[PDB]
């Protein structure tokens, strides 16, 4: 009964570091042939609040959106708990999110002092201190901006192509 259509069919998706969350308070998902990943956890796939989180990542990173994974995305951008209750859904979005010259508008967080807690969101852009000298908010050697653009081109390999992800947690 929940109106997921606004989430899955949204015209624009968030960068993974600034992942979007929508609060809502199931047969159409299986019959979709566009979904390339569909994995549910802690529930029989066949609820007070349901949270729909959505973002874009690269194809070879979709595996990190699962309980117990590691990598830049799971570590620094979007982290699921070990006891996750919900579903992860993804589909290739090369046709919407790639561009011949390259689409660079989607970002991910490249540096962080510690790993995200589950469902934590970090949208800060503090200069990252990679060495012993403090940075005082100034970019320079060992003092780095912490976000990095994806480079989505339609002729890249599928693992480098953009995927839209929706995480439904109950």
């Amino acid at each position: 009964l929940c109106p997921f259509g606004e989430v899955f069919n949204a015209t624009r998706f968030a960068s993974v570091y600034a992942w979007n969350r929508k609060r809502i308070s199931y047969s159409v998902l299986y019959n979709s042939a566009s979904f390339s990943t569909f994995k549910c956890y802690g529930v029989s796939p066949t609820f007070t609040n349901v949270y729909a989180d959505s973002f874009v990542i690269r194809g070879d990173e979709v595996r990190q959106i699962a309980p117990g994974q590691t990598g830049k995305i799971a570590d620094y951008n979007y982290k699921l708990p070990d006891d996750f209750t919900g579903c992860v859904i993804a589909w290739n979005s090369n046709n919407l999110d790639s561009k011949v010259g390259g689409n660079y508008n989607y970002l991910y967080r490249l540096f962080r002092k510690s790993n995200l807690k589950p469902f934590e969101r970090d949208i800060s852009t503090e200069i990252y201190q990679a060495g012993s000298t403090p940075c005082n908010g100034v970019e320079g050697f060992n003092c780095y901006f912490p976000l990095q653009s994806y480079g989505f081109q339609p002729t890249n390999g599928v693992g480098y192509q953009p995927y839209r992800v929706v995480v439904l947690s109950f």
């Epitope: 100034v138 320079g140 050697f141 901006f145 990095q148």
Partner: nanobody
Framework: VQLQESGGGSVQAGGSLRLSCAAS????????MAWFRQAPGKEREGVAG???????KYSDSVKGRFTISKDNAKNALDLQMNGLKPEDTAMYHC?????????????????????WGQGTQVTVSS
């Protein structure tokens, strides 16, 4: 967080253009930022870079003709292009946010800048 370039188009050889890259969620004043360009089927070239200290570097092909500067009123990075040549025809691309190395080599290392705009086409006709 994004960079948005504008100011490109068509111009006669010998003419002038000013590119601008408006930054959202990114403070240009304290940033390392650069302009690159790519002519079709050809290798990307760094044209002008600037560091937090206000120190600029130019490629040999544009020195004496281009000036890179920070606009802190609009929070944008500007590129003044004078004495334009058919040579200069290319997609011009702005990048910001040092993620590796030092700002002084970014013209040779575009991957050392994390955030990239969409590009703006400049076509110089003879």
């Amino acid at each position: 967080v994004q960079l948005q370039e504008s100011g490109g188009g068509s111009v006669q050889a010998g003419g002038s253009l000013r590119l601008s890259c408006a930054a959202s969620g990114y403070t240009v004043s304290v940033g390392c930022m650069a302009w690159f360009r790519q002519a079709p089927g050809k290798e990307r070239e760094g044209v002008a870079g600037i560091d937090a200290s206000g120190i600029t570097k130019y490629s040999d092909s544009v020195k004496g003709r281009f000036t890179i500067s920070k606009d802190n009123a609009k929070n944008a990075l500007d590129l003044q292009m004078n004495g334009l040549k058919p040579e200069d025809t290319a997609m011009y691309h702005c990048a910001a946010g040092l993620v590796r190395g030092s700002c002084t080599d970014v013209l040779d290392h575009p991957s050392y800048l994390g955030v990239w705009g969409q590009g703006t086409q400049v076509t110089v006709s003879s």
